[PDB]
Structure formats: C-alpha cells, structure tokens
Amino acid sequence: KQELSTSRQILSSYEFLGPEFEGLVQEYTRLKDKIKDNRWMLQELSKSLP
Amino acid sequence: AAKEKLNSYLDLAPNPSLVKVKIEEAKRELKATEVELTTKVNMMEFVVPEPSKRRLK
C-alpha cells in the first residue's frame, strides 16, 4: 500500500507535460525498439559463416 | 502496473526540444545499422567449381 502510493505520486509529475510529450515518448520508444531488433539480426548472421 | 508505466519515461529529459534531438539521433543510428546489414548480404555470390551437388570438408 505504501509502494503504490509513492509510484502514483511520481507518475502524476510526467502526466502533467501533455499529450504531445506522450507522442514523442511513444516515437522514441518505437525507434529504440527497431534499433534493438536490427542489432539483434546482424549478430545472428555472423555466427552462420561456415 | 504503476512501476512499468514510470520506466518508459526515464531516458527522456522532461524537455520536448531535447527529446526531438534524441529522436533524430536514434533515426541516424537506425540508417547505419541497415547499411551494414545490406553489405553482408551481397558478398555472398561467386565462390566456383565443382563439388557435387552434395559435400564435408
């Protein structure tokens, strides 16, 4: 009950920066996820050179 | 449910202008990793004769 109360207090400070910020955060998050996927794909092709 | 919603916000300074810069940096990094992935794919072609259709060594 104490941990839930602290986390809910911090989230309330970011939610105050508007929908536009949330859009940016969503975009950033999407891009980081694609970079992570491409790096992961390059690593898997090198192990296969027999 | 409340902690998971907080970890998505931490790499981003609460400043929109600075976030746009981080987004542009992430777009450059995505183009470089895509070129490296295409080159390694082409060298793929020549090596010749011979052995069946088949073989070990």
mmCIF file of N, CA and C in Angstrom:
data_model
loop_
_atom_site.group_PDB
_atom_site.id
_atom_site.type_symbol
_atom_site.label_atom_id
_atom_site.label_comp_id
_atom_site.label_asym_id
_atom_site.label_seq_id
_atom_site.Cartn_x
_atom_site.Cartn_y
_atom_site.Cartn_z
ATOM 1 N N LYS A 1 0.825 -1.205 0.000
ATOM 2 C CA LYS A 1 0.000 0.000 0.000
ATOM 3 C C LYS A 1 0.862 1.258 0.000
ATOM 4 N N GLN A 2 2.046 1.144 0.710
ATOM 5 C CA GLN A 2 2.979 2.266 0.749
ATOM 6 C C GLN A 2 3.685 2.439 -0.592
ATOM 7 N N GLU A 3 4.191 1.420 -1.277
ATOM 8 C CA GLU A 3 4.843 1.449 -2.582
ATOM 9 C C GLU A 3 3.898 1.970 -3.660
ATOM 10 N N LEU A 4 2.660 1.575 -3.636
ATOM 11 C CA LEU A 4 1.654 2.016 -4.596
ATOM 12 C C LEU A 4 1.400 3.514 -4.469
ATOM 13 N N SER A 5 1.396 3.952 -3.262
ATOM 14 C CA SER A 5 1.178 5.379 -3.044
ATOM 15 C C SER A 5 2.342 6.205 -3.582
ATOM 16 N N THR A 6 3.681 5.831 -3.439
ATOM 17 C CA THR A 6 4.870 6.523 -3.919
ATOM 18 C C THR A 6 4.916 6.527 -5.445
ATOM 19 N N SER A 7 4.702 5.501 -6.115
ATOM 20 C CA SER A 7 4.713 5.373 -7.569
ATOM 21 C C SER A 7 3.614 6.216 -8.207
ATOM 22 N N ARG A 8 2.517 6.300 -7.626
ATOM 23 C CA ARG A 8 1.389 7.066 -8.145
ATOM 24 C C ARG A 8 1.641 8.565 -8.019
ATOM 25 N N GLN A 9 2.464 8.876 -7.033
ATOM 26 C CA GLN A 9 2.828 10.279 -6.863
ATOM 27 C C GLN A 9 3.795 10.733 -7.951
ATOM 28 N N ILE A 10 4.853 9.935 -8.421
ATOM 29 C CA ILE A 10 5.840 10.237 -9.452
ATOM 30 C C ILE A 10 5.164 10.268 -10.820
ATOM 31 N N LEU A 11 4.383 9.450 -11.180
ATOM 32 C CA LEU A 11 3.664 9.359 -12.446
ATOM 33 C C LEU A 11 2.768 10.575 -12.653
ATOM 34 N N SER A 12 2.328 11.070 -11.680
ATOM 35 C CA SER A 12 1.486 12.259 -11.765
ATOM 36 C C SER A 12 2.285 13.469 -12.235
ATOM 37 N N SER A 13 3.693 13.571 -11.983
ATOM 38 C CA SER A 13 4.554 14.666 -12.412
ATOM 39 C C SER A 13 4.791 14.626 -13.919
ATOM 40 N N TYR A 14 4.963 13.533 -14.671
ATOM 41 C CA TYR A 14 5.152 13.345 -16.104
ATOM 42 C C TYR A 14 3.846 13.557 -16.860
ATOM 43 N N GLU A 15 2.771 13.136 -16.358
ATOM 44 C CA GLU A 15 1.453 13.220 -16.982
ATOM 45 C C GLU A 15 0.993 14.670 -17.110
ATOM 46 N N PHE A 16 1.719 15.525 -16.275
ATOM 47 C CA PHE A 16 1.401 16.949 -16.303
ATOM 48 C C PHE A 16 1.933 17.598 -17.575
ATOM 49 N N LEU A 17 3.169 16.998 -18.498
ATOM 50 C CA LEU A 17 3.838 17.566 -19.665
ATOM 51 C C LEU A 17 2.989 17.385 -20.918
ATOM 52 N N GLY A 18 1.695 16.992 -21.081
ATOM 53 C CA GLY A 18 0.663 16.985 -22.106
ATOM 54 C C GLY A 18 0.788 15.820 -23.069
ATOM 55 N N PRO A 19 -0.181 15.616 -23.987
ATOM 56 C CA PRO A 19 -0.315 14.553 -24.987
ATOM 57 C C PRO A 19 0.815 14.562 -26.012
ATOM 58 N N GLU A 20 1.304 15.786 -26.321
ATOM 59 C CA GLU A 20 2.356 15.938 -27.322
ATOM 60 C C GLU A 20 3.640 15.239 -26.883
ATOM 61 N N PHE A 21 3.912 15.330 -25.593
ATOM 62 C CA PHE A 21 5.086 14.707 -24.994
ATOM 63 C C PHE A 21 4.964 13.188 -25.011
ATOM 64 N N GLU A 22 3.749 12.740 -24.706
ATOM 65 C CA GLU A 22 3.443 11.315 -24.746
ATOM 66 C C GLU A 22 3.662 10.741 -26.142
ATOM 67 N N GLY A 23 3.253 11.525 -27.260
ATOM 68 C CA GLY A 23 3.514 11.156 -28.644
ATOM 69 C C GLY A 23 4.990 10.998 -28.952
ATOM 70 N N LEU A 24 5.779 11.937 -28.368
ATOM 71 C CA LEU A 24 7.224 11.917 -28.563
ATOM 72 C C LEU A 24 7.846 10.700 -27.888
ATOM 73 N N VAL A 25 7.330 10.425 -26.716
ATOM 74 C CA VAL A 25 7.824 9.302 -25.925
ATOM 75 C C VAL A 25 7.508 7.991 -26.637
ATOM 76 N N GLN A 26 6.294 7.913 -27.187
ATOM 77 C CA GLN A 26 5.885 6.742 -27.954
ATOM 78 C C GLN A 26 6.784 6.538 -29.170
ATOM 79 N N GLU A 27 7.168 7.674 -29.875
ATOM 80 C CA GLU A 27 8.034 7.616 -31.050
ATOM 81 C C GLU A 27 9.444 7.166 -30.674
ATOM 82 N N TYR A 28 9.916 7.682 -29.628
ATOM 83 C CA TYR A 28 11.246 7.334 -29.142
ATOM 84 C C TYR A 28 11.322 5.859 -28.768
ATOM 85 N N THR A 29 10.325 5.503 -28.170
ATOM 86 C CA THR A 29 10.247 4.115 -27.722
ATOM 87 C C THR A 29 10.166 3.166 -28.913
ATOM 88 N N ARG A 30 9.394 3.461 -29.927
ATOM 89 C CA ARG A 30 9.271 2.700 -31.166
ATOM 90 C C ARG A 30 10.618 2.581 -31.872
ATOM 91 N N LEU A 31 11.365 3.707 -32.013
ATOM 92 C CA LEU A 31 12.656 3.765 -32.690
ATOM 93 C C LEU A 31 13.691 2.911 -31.964
ATOM 94 N N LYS A 32 13.713 2.920 -30.570
ATOM 95 C CA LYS A 32 14.659 2.161 -29.756
ATOM 96 C C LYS A 32 14.405 0.661 -29.873
ATOM 97 N N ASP A 33 13.138 0.408 -30.011
ATOM 98 C CA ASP A 33 12.749 -0.989 -30.183
ATOM 99 C C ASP A 33 13.212 -1.524 -31.535
ATOM 100 N N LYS A 34 13.179 -0.746 -32.706
ATOM 101 C CA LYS A 34 13.611 -1.136 -34.045
ATOM 102 C C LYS A 34 15.127 -1.297 -34.108
ATOM 103 N N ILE A 35 15.932 -0.429 -33.486
ATOM 104 C CA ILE A 35 17.389 -0.464 -33.439
ATOM 105 C C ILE A 35 17.851 -1.734 -32.727
ATOM 106 N N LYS A 36 17.081 -1.962 -31.593
ATOM 107 C CA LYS A 36 17.388 -3.161 -30.817
ATOM 108 C C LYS A 36 17.142 -4.425 -31.639
ATOM 109 N N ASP A 37 16.039 -4.479 -32.426
ATOM 110 C CA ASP A 37 15.703 -5.587 -33.315
ATOM 111 C C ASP A 37 16.754 -5.750 -34.410
ATOM 112 N N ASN A 38 17.286 -4.691 -35.145
ATOM 113 C CA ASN A 38 18.276 -4.738 -36.216
ATOM 114 C C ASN A 38 19.624 -5.244 -35.713
ATOM 115 N N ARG A 39 20.052 -4.857 -34.534
ATOM 116 C CA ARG A 39 21.308 -5.286 -33.931
ATOM 117 C C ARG A 39 21.270 -6.768 -33.576
ATOM 118 N N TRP A 40 20.061 -7.001 -33.117
ATOM 119 C CA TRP A 40 19.864 -8.417 -32.824
ATOM 120 C C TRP A 40 19.963 -9.255 -34.094
ATOM 121 N N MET A 41 19.444 -8.857 -35.243
ATOM 122 C CA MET A 41 19.509 -9.545 -36.530
ATOM 123 C C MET A 41 20.944 -9.608 -37.040
ATOM 124 N N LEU A 42 21.822 -8.706 -37.077
ATOM 125 C CA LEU A 42 23.216 -8.660 -37.501
ATOM 126 C C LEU A 42 24.057 -9.661 -36.714
ATOM 127 N N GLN A 43 23.854 -9.760 -35.403
ATOM 128 C CA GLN A 43 24.564 -10.701 -34.542
ATOM 129 C C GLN A 43 24.248 -12.144 -34.923
ATOM 130 N N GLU A 44 23.086 -12.398 -35.232
ATOM 131 C CA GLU A 44 22.683 -13.745 -35.629
ATOM 132 C C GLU A 44 23.269 -14.119 -36.988
ATOM 133 N N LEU A 45 23.513 -13.305 -38.047
ATOM 134 C CA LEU A 45 24.090 -13.609 -39.351
ATOM 135 C C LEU A 45 25.579 -13.910 -39.230
ATOM 136 N N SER A 46 26.443 -13.364 -38.468
ATOM 137 C CA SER A 46 27.870 -13.619 -38.294
ATOM 138 C C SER A 46 28.121 -15.031 -37.781
ATOM 139 N N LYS A 47 27.410 -15.535 -36.789
ATOM 140 C CA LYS A 47 27.623 -16.896 -36.308
ATOM 141 C C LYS A 47 27.427 -17.914 -37.428
ATOM 142 N N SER A 48 26.714 -17.662 -38.495
ATOM 143 C CA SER A 48 26.470 -18.665 -39.526
ATOM 144 C C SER A 48 27.598 -18.688 -40.553
ATOM 145 N N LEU A 49 28.903 -18.072 -40.601
ATOM 146 C CA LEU A 49 29.913 -18.214 -41.645
ATOM 147 C C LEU A 49 30.731 -19.484 -41.442
ATOM 148 N N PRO A 50 30.269 -20.862 -41.295
ATOM 149 C CA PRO A 50 30.735 -21.820 -42.300
ATOM 150 C C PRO A 50 30.285 -21.458 -43.713
ATOM 151 N N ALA B 1 1.766 -2.477 -12.191
ATOM 152 C CA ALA B 1 1.171 -1.683 -13.262
ATOM 153 C C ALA B 1 1.582 -0.218 -13.154
ATOM 154 N N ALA B 2 1.789 0.228 -11.990
ATOM 155 C CA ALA B 2 2.209 1.610 -11.770
ATOM 156 C C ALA B 2 3.702 1.779 -12.037
ATOM 157 N N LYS B 3 4.715 0.823 -11.731
ATOM 158 C CA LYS B 3 6.159 0.857 -11.952
ATOM 159 C C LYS B 3 6.493 0.711 -13.434
ATOM 160 N N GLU B 4 5.837 -0.164 -14.092
ATOM 161 C CA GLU B 4 6.009 -0.341 -15.531
ATOM 162 C C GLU B 4 5.678 0.943 -16.289
ATOM 163 N N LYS B 5 4.690 1.664 -15.970
ATOM 164 C CA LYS B 5 4.331 2.938 -16.586
ATOM 165 C C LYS B 5 5.391 4.000 -16.314
ATOM 166 N N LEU B 6 6.252 4.066 -15.346
ATOM 167 C CA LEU B 6 7.292 5.014 -14.956
ATOM 168 C C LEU B 6 8.585 4.746 -15.719
ATOM 169 N N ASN B 7 9.137 3.416 -15.910
ATOM 170 C CA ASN B 7 10.344 3.035 -16.636
ATOM 171 C C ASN B 7 10.312 3.534 -18.077
ATOM 172 N N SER B 8 9.298 3.714 -18.885
ATOM 173 C CA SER B 8 9.141 4.236 -20.240
ATOM 174 C C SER B 8 9.473 5.724 -20.299
ATOM 175 N N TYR B 9 9.607 6.521 -19.298
ATOM 176 C CA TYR B 9 9.797 7.966 -19.239
ATOM 177 C C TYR B 9 11.232 8.312 -18.860
ATOM 178 N N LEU B 10 12.219 7.478 -18.288
ATOM 179 C CA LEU B 10 13.439 7.794 -17.554
ATOM 180 C C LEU B 10 14.542 8.250 -18.503
ATOM 181 N N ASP B 11 14.709 7.592 -19.874
ATOM 182 C CA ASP B 11 15.789 8.023 -20.757
ATOM 183 C C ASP B 11 15.492 9.398 -21.354
ATOM 184 N N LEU B 12 14.345 9.992 -21.080
ATOM 185 C CA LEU B 12 13.888 11.209 -21.741
ATOM 186 C C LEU B 12 13.810 12.368 -20.752
ATOM 187 N N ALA B 13 14.759 13.468 -20.854
ATOM 188 C CA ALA B 13 14.598 14.688 -20.067
ATOM 189 C C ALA B 13 13.197 15.269 -20.236
ATOM 190 N N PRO B 14 12.441 15.577 -19.367
ATOM 191 C CA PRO B 14 11.117 16.201 -19.415
ATOM 192 C C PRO B 14 11.100 17.488 -20.238
ATOM 193 N N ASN B 15 11.972 17.664 -21.141
ATOM 194 C CA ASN B 15 12.023 18.798 -22.058
ATOM 195 C C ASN B 15 11.788 18.363 -23.501
ATOM 196 N N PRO B 16 10.673 18.646 -24.256
ATOM 197 C CA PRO B 16 10.271 18.259 -25.609
ATOM 198 C C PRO B 16 11.373 18.490 -26.642
ATOM 199 N N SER B 17 12.108 19.744 -26.555
ATOM 200 C CA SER B 17 13.110 20.124 -27.545
ATOM 201 C C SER B 17 14.274 19.139 -27.559
ATOM 202 N N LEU B 18 14.643 18.656 -26.334
ATOM 203 C CA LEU B 18 15.776 17.760 -26.138
ATOM 204 C C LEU B 18 15.427 16.338 -26.566
ATOM 205 N N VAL B 19 14.120 16.058 -26.489
ATOM 206 C CA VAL B 19 13.616 14.745 -26.879
ATOM 207 C C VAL B 19 13.647 14.611 -28.399
ATOM 208 N N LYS B 20 13.372 15.640 -29.135
ATOM 209 C CA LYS B 20 13.413 15.678 -30.594
ATOM 210 C C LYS B 20 14.819 15.387 -31.112
ATOM 211 N N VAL B 21 15.849 15.911 -30.301
ATOM 212 C CA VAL B 21 17.252 15.700 -30.647
ATOM 213 C C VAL B 21 17.603 14.222 -30.500
ATOM 214 N N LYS B 22 16.952 13.634 -29.401
ATOM 215 C CA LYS B 22 17.232 12.227 -29.126
ATOM 216 C C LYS B 22 16.556 11.321 -30.151
ATOM 217 N N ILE B 23 15.455 11.729 -30.611
ATOM 218 C CA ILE B 23 14.721 11.022 -31.655
ATOM 219 C C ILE B 23 15.517 11.053 -32.957
ATOM 220 N N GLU B 24 16.142 12.259 -33.326
ATOM 221 C CA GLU B 24 16.927 12.404 -34.549
ATOM 222 C C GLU B 24 18.192 11.553 -34.497
ATOM 223 N N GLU B 25 18.801 11.441 -33.336
ATOM 224 C CA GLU B 25 19.976 10.605 -33.109
ATOM 225 C C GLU B 25 19.648 9.127 -33.299
ATOM 226 N N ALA B 26 18.500 8.780 -32.883
ATOM 227 C CA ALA B 26 18.036 7.399 -32.990
ATOM 228 C C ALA B 26 17.707 7.040 -34.436
ATOM 229 N N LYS B 27 17.238 7.941 -35.275
ATOM 230 C CA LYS B 27 16.977 7.787 -36.702
ATOM 231 C C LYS B 27 18.274 7.584 -37.481
ATOM 232 N N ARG B 28 19.465 8.314 -37.138
ATOM 233 C CA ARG B 28 20.772 8.179 -37.774
ATOM 234 C C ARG B 28 21.373 6.802 -37.503
ATOM 235 N N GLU B 29 21.140 6.393 -36.235
ATOM 236 C CA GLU B 29 21.679 5.101 -35.817
ATOM 237 C C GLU B 29 20.949 3.951 -36.504
ATOM 238 N N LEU B 30 19.731 4.035 -36.767
ATOM 239 C CA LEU B 30 18.929 3.050 -37.485
ATOM 240 C C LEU B 30 19.389 2.926 -38.934
ATOM 241 N N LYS B 31 19.790 4.046 -39.751
ATOM 242 C CA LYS B 31 20.262 4.047 -41.132
ATOM 243 C C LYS B 31 21.611 3.343 -41.253
ATOM 244 N N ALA B 32 22.590 3.544 -40.269
ATOM 245 C CA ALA B 32 23.923 2.943 -40.266
ATOM 246 C C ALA B 32 23.840 1.427 -40.115
ATOM 247 N N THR B 33 22.964 0.966 -39.237
ATOM 248 C CA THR B 33 22.828 -0.459 -38.952
ATOM 249 C C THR B 33 22.139 -1.178 -40.107
ATOM 250 N N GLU B 34 21.346 -0.508 -40.875
ATOM 251 C CA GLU B 34 20.655 -1.021 -42.055
ATOM 252 C C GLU B 34 21.621 -1.213 -43.220
ATOM 253 N N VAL B 35 22.698 -0.287 -43.448
ATOM 254 C CA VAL B 35 23.710 -0.394 -44.494
ATOM 255 C C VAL B 35 24.616 -1.591 -44.220
ATOM 256 N N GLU B 36 24.949 -1.765 -42.929
ATOM 257 C CA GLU B 36 25.802 -2.887 -42.547
ATOM 258 C C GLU B 36 25.093 -4.220 -42.769
ATOM 259 N N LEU B 37 23.953 -4.247 -42.629
ATOM 260 C CA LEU B 37 23.138 -5.440 -42.826
ATOM 261 C C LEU B 37 23.018 -5.777 -44.308
ATOM 262 N N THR B 38 22.954 -4.789 -45.291
ATOM 263 C CA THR B 38 22.840 -4.985 -46.731
ATOM 264 C C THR B 38 24.157 -5.487 -47.314
ATOM 265 N N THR B 39 25.333 -4.947 -46.941
ATOM 266 C CA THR B 39 26.648 -5.329 -47.443
ATOM 267 C C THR B 39 26.950 -6.788 -47.113
ATOM 268 N N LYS B 40 26.700 -7.138 -46.040
ATOM 269 C CA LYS B 40 26.988 -8.503 -45.609
ATOM 270 C C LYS B 40 26.072 -9.505 -46.305
ATOM 271 N N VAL B 41 25.184 -9.012 -46.786
ATOM 272 C CA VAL B 41 24.263 -9.867 -47.527
ATOM 273 C C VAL B 41 24.798 -10.101 -48.939
ATOM 274 N N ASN B 42 25.443 -9.061 -49.791
ATOM 275 C CA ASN B 42 25.870 -9.177 -51.182
ATOM 276 C C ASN B 42 27.080 -10.096 -51.324
ATOM 277 N N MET B 43 28.173 -9.985 -50.617
ATOM 278 C CA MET B 43 29.409 -10.756 -50.707
ATOM 279 C C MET B 43 29.117 -12.252 -50.730
ATOM 280 N N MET B 44 28.196 -12.494 -50.849
ATOM 281 C CA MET B 44 27.543 -13.789 -50.689
ATOM 282 C C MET B 44 27.774 -14.672 -51.913
ATOM 283 N N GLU B 45 28.244 -14.100 -53.297
ATOM 284 C CA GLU B 45 27.842 -14.578 -54.617
ATOM 285 C C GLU B 45 28.698 -15.761 -55.059
ATOM 286 N N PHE B 46 30.191 -15.536 -55.512
ATOM 287 C CA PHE B 46 30.998 -16.193 -56.534
ATOM 288 C C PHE B 46 31.373 -17.607 -56.102
ATOM 289 N N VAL B 47 32.060 -17.875 -55.127
ATOM 290 C CA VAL B 47 32.978 -18.997 -54.963
ATOM 291 C C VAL B 47 32.382 -20.250 -55.600
ATOM 292 N N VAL B 48 33.238 -21.072 -56.742
ATOM 293 C CA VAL B 48 33.140 -21.798 -58.003
ATOM 294 C C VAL B 48 32.972 -23.291 -57.730
ATOM 295 N N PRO B 49 34.381 -24.331 -58.123
ATOM 296 C CA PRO B 49 33.855 -25.180 -59.196
ATOM 297 C C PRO B 49 32.380 -25.523 -59.007
ATOM 298 N N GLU B 50 32.281 -26.762 -58.592
ATOM 299 C CA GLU B 50 32.720 -28.150 -58.701
ATOM 300 C C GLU B 50 31.875 -29.066 -57.821
ATOM 301 N N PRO B 51 32.480 -29.291 -56.636
ATOM 302 C CA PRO B 51 31.900 -30.397 -55.869
ATOM 303 C C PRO B 51 30.445 -30.146 -55.482
ATOM 304 N N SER B 52 29.599 -31.673 -55.444
ATOM 305 C CA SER B 52 28.539 -32.493 -56.021
ATOM 306 C C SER B 52 27.257 -32.399 -55.201
ATOM 307 N N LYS B 53 26.381 -32.326 -56.234
ATOM 308 C CA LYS B 53 25.748 -31.047 -55.928
ATOM 309 C C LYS B 53 25.707 -30.798 -54.424
ATOM 310 N N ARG B 54 26.038 -31.373 -52.978
ATOM 311 C CA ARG B 54 26.484 -32.556 -52.252
ATOM 312 C C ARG B 54 27.081 -32.178 -50.902
ATOM 313 N N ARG B 55 28.631 -31.934 -50.251
ATOM 314 C CA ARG B 55 29.866 -32.490 -49.709
ATOM 315 C C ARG B 55 30.261 -31.788 -48.414
ATOM 316 N N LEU B 56 31.456 -32.212 -47.291
ATOM 317 C CA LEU B 56 32.060 -32.464 -45.988
ATOM 318 C C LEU B 56 33.075 -31.379 -45.640
ATOM 319 N N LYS B 57 34.178 -30.887 -46.444
ATOM 320 C CA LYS B 57 35.477 -30.996 -45.784
ATOM 321 C C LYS B 57 35.711 -29.824 -44.836
#
